[PDB]
Amino acid sequence: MECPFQIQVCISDRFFAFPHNLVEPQSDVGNKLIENLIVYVPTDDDRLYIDKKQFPKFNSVLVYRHEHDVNIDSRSPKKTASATIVYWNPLVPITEIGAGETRVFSVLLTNNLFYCNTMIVHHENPKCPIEFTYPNLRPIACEIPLSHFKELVESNDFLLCFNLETSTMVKILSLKRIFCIFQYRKQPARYVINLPHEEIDNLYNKLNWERTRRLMKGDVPSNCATVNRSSLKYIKQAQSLLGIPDYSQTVVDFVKMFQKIIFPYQLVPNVIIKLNNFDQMVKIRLFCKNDSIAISSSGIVPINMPDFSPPNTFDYSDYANRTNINFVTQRVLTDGGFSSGITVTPVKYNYYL
Amino acid sequence: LINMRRYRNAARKLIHHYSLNSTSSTEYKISDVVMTMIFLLRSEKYHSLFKLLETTFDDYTCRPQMTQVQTDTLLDAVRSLLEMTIDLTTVDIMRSSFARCFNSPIMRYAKIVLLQNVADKRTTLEELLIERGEKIQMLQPQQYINSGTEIPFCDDAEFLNRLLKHIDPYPLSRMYYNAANTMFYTTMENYAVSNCKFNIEDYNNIFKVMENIRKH
Amino acid sequence: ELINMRRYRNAARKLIHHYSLNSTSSTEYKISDVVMTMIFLLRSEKYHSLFKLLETTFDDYTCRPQMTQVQTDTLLDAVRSLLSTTIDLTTVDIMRSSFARCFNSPIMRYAKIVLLQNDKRTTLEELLIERGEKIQMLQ
Amino acid sequence: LINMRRYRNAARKLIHHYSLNSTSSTEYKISDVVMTMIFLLRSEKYHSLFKLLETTFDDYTCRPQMTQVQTDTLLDAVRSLLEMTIDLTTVDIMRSSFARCFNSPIMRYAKIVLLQNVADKRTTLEELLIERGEKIQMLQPQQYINSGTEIPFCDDAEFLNRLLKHIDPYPLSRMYYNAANTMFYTTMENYAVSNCKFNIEDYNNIFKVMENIRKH
Amino acid sequence: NKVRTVTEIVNSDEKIQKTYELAEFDLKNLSSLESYETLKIKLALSKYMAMLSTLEMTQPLLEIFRNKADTRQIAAVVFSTLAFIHNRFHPLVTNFTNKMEFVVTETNDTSIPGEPILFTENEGVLLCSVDRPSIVKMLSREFDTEALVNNCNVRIAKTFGASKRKDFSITEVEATQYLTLLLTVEHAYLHYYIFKNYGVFEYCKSLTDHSLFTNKLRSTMSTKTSNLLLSKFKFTIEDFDKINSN
């Protein structure tokens, strides 16, 4: 994928609402500013949230729904020197560009904009929402969050709904905008997405890839992540086994519970191990400030060393042999009076014992 | 060079049949025996089993003597080959079967035999009955239920229908064949290990009885 | 060494000579003998060509692979060295067919239970009783 | 030198007849066989087929072994020669036919035979019926029509007359001969591939039935 | 064989004769009976599986029998099977009256070939002996899920007449395991029935020779009780005559 340098993209959670102030007329080759402005939006309804009166710099303002023009190759979009072109949360390739630099504002960072040369990323202090999967909720038409803006900034229990024929990209953009609104909420808000589990998982995967793109473009890390459905099911099983009411315990706190074990016992909690495995299907390593070693799923590892020590570091032949293994297994079977379900494995060792 | 994979597959099938670990019945031939022996020779993993079978070429009416380490290695090799569990009794069964095959002459027809020469003294069913019954009476009931009780029949008719659907594509003929041959081969193994003659006549009389009850 | 190359040579020579001489029942040999011969041929690189030929004989006869004059001469020389009396590619092919048949020969197996498909008819009186009960049950 | 073109033509005709790819029937002779073999030898293009047929001079009761590349080359050569489609089944049919011809002695009269020795186990029509019917019943109808419907007869009498004129110069005798022999040869191929005996008697009984119905 | 019918009007002598070959109706009857028997047997097997599920044991059957420690579950399964067979013979019975003891042998010198499940009273109550190693061996023996088992004319006719149709852990292997267990317990139940109703000496004689089963059972079984499971097929030992001569 290639992008034309004439497009400049700014990424900011704030862009869930259109940045009227940031728009500015572009100049032609003759350095003549263009008083005509064209704003592109992903859906027709978006037009209602563009206030033409907020563009004093321009004399004429028009708004249209950006639509993939199959007749134009995005590698070289047509230019329209007669107007300044701005795209808001584009979901399809930009086939048209304005005078000077075509401006783009987006809360999402799809591949289309990923290769865009000029990338301005606004940084925010993270503020995470609460996943509240559960069958007094406040329904929210995700396609039009700004309509529910007041409720989104006031209440704390939202049922996220979508029109049947809503497109996947529209869903992704709506979710991103809602999550930005929550990022600006002082109080985290619980929400439930009225969608099939697989669809929600795919949406979360795409959002994760978008966040990865933002990081690669220089965005600040945010702990406000999301959990795949299998991971949520595992966490729920763990909480139930421990006798923890699901509504009472949040996943984040549940995981944090084992930070007391992480360092002092120099062990990786099994919950974190399982979550990492789920993400992999969709290894671990960490340390402490000034620490000389790293705790990993494999055990202790010298800092900056590979996750596994050289193969010949330790000789296990003494016990890592069929004779010893069979002897121990037979002893166990005899002592316990067992006949099946018994399995003994030699213990290997990483860098350290 | 040789198709070690095909050799291994033939060896595995032949070993299964000769160890009575598979109800599956199919034709076998000197080509298959040669496949097996060549695979065993070529495989470093199975040299011990190759040696065991090769020893069958002699009088073969003898008990091989092995260290505990040797026996464990052989059992591990066999268990890895058949992926199961197993026993040195099965080892001896294979030894006897392969010895009989090797000693048998080349024939235009397959030879149908019965397991024998497994584990010296010939014991009758009556003597086994007496001894085993005495030992059983010596034994004490590990667990018991009280009088009466009630058979726990299922109730969910929907569950029954689901199970019926799940089992419909299973051919009763194949299942019956497999079950009957499983029981027959296990009985054969028990008899051979006990060194007590197998009463083919009574084993077939079981089905004779089945038919005689059915006809009325 | 697992293989007693001398005894293996003896058995291989015995069987190969017999089948070169003739091709019939020959009710004086054993699957043990065939295994002995084949293992010998495998182990001896000299007779590796014969080994490959008989391995071909396994399963359908298929056809002798095309050999150069040098290859055929070397084959006959190796056969005679194992055996002496002169031979020819015709004898080699005949013996190859004999061994194909041997390998296709069946071996010992264990008996098994066999299912056989098996008369009586119901009476209209009992049929009527049951069916009429059903009808009374009907809606 | 040789008339490679005439040699090729004779080779093509003989190959067509021996592969049952042409209903055309004509006399053939040792001169024709020699034409064919000489053409194959001289042609660099067809060396593989020449080798295949030459191998028939031996016992010829054997399955040649070829790499996939060799088989593809042979099939390409045959298909280019006959300009058609074809199959390694046809390759084997030609091999068997030419082996029978080569092994046959010089005779004052032509030898009329039936296809055989194509693709080991002899199967009866009854066994084929059982197995094929079971597999067919397993199969599911790819497509179907509803009940009733209506045969779409044509209506344009002028169109019918035009077709009649177009077909008038076609000899019904030749068309019948060609069709009957096509069906017969395809049945022969199916039987030979299936390794099931062809019932010449019943095949002729078909025409016996035709006559018995006609006479009434 | 065959039959024929004649149609004729009372006042007229012009009669129309048609002939019928009974083979078609024979095929109809045989197919109907085969389907009915298959349905009955599958129903019984499903019922057995369902009641075992009702017992609600976490492990699968083979794992249960492999777990030597948990004699409780082995005894439960064995008794449930025995009671199920008993009821199948006496549908009005849903319990077993006298309490039952159970023991699980663990050695060849403790097991009796050919009767993995057997019975013996302690002079006050009956004890059931179980050869768990033998049960495990039977249920573990590899099964054939591929080969088929079997007049060619009627065979072809059935082939062309009958049709075919193209979340349970059960495969044909597990169904086979359940069937094998049921058959073994049925054999043991027949032994126990002969014991209870003809004395310990008769029980021992039956163990020695099962042939007595013929009379000792058919006196009551073939008349009042559902036929034996094995009744579904006629079984025979391959090369039985030559083997006997051996």
Curated annotation (Swiss-Prot), chain A:
The keyword Protease does not apply. It comes from the Viruses. One of its GO terms (biological process) is transport of viral material towards nucleus. Disulfide bonds: none annotated. It is found in: Host cytoplasm; Host nucleus. Keywords: Host cytoplasm, Host nucleus. Its main location: host cell. It holds the Pfam family AcMNPV_Ac109. One of its GO terms (cellular component) is host cell cytoplasm. Plays a role in the transport of the budded virion (BV) to the host nucleus and for occlusion of viral progeny. This is Protein AC109.
Swiss-Prot record, chain C:
It is found in: Host nucleus; Virion. This is Protein C42. It comes from the Viruses. Belongs to the baculoviridae C42 protein family. Forms a complex with proteins E27 and p78/83. The interaction with p78/83 mediates nuclear translocation of P78/83. Interacts with protein Ac102. Interacts with IE0. Plays a role in host nuclear actin polymerization by recruiting p78/73 protein that is capable of activating an actin-related protein 2/3 complex to initiate nuclear actin polymerization. The chain holds residues 112 to 258 of 361 of the full protein.
UniProtKB/Swiss-Prot annotation, chain E:
One of its GO terms (biological process) is symbiont-mediated perturbation of host cell cycle progression. GO terms for cellular component: membrane; viral envelope; virion membrane. Its main location: virion. Transmembrane segments: none annotated. Keywords: Host-virus interaction, Membrane, Modulation of host cell cycle by viral cyclin-like protein, Modulation of host cell cycle by virus, Viral envelope protein, Virion. It is found in: Virion membrane. Disulfide bonds: none annotated. Interacts with host mus209/PCNA, cdc2 and cdk6. Forms a complex with proteins C42 and p78/83. Acts as a cyclin-like protein and plays a role in the modulation of host cell cycle. May promote G2/S arrest by interacting with host mus209/PCNA, cdc2 and cdk6. The cell cycle arrest is characterized by an intact nuclear envelope, concomitant with sustained activity of host cdc2. However, viral DNA replication still occurs in the arrested cells. Belongs to the baculoviridae E27 family. This is Occlusion-derived virus envelope protein E27. It comes from Autographa californica nuclear polyhedrosis virus (AcMNPV). The gene is E27.
